[PDB]
């Protein structure tokens, strides 16, 4: 799963 970027839904 993605830690990612809160801005990418």
């Amino acid at each position: 799963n993605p830690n990612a970027n809160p801005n990418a839904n």
Partner: antibody
Amino acid sequence: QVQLVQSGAEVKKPGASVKVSCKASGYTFTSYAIHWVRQAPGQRLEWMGWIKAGNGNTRYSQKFQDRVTITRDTSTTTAYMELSSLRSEDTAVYYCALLTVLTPDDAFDIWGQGTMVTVSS
Amino acid sequence: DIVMTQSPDSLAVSLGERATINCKSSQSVLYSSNNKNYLAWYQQKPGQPPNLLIYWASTRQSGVPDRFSGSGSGTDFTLTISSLQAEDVAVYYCHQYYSSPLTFGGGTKVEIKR
């Protein structure tokens, strides 16, 4: 017009600290996270961290050994990034930006103009 | 971390020709829950901040010309400029926003042959 405006270039001596500002306007400040990315001369973009403007939670890159500190002032709709124990490798252009704000209805991506920091005596 | 690697480091083509940039990720960027590739392409001209071109690996943001397109899945992606224009001189970066820390490619310098 979503817009991000950063403070001006500065010179700092080795071992000192620097704090860069990022004024946000044209949108609901607290609903998005503001990232900080630097670009050393002749080098690739390097992610440092981000802060959710609402709850103020932060996530930092381990590669900076926790000498980065990202904070946020909601009333001034402004985000800050402080980098301490400056070394020669920290000379770079420091950007704040709303990276990849993706929703089914609309998507956008906004950056500040950059802030050049030179570590020199 | 997720290392991003681009090929070539630089390329030169004539005006109106096609230009392509490859980007590989050290591990997969496709998320199985929504089947979307957390990959983006950025354009950066000298003295300016990057400019988003493609997100979700193949979706082009509203203000970008049609000649820009992206393809790929998982660990291998390609940026395509179908008809290079003079104003396309820039360093192009691929970027993964899948795992922390977010990482960018080494950049690909695009030049015009004149």
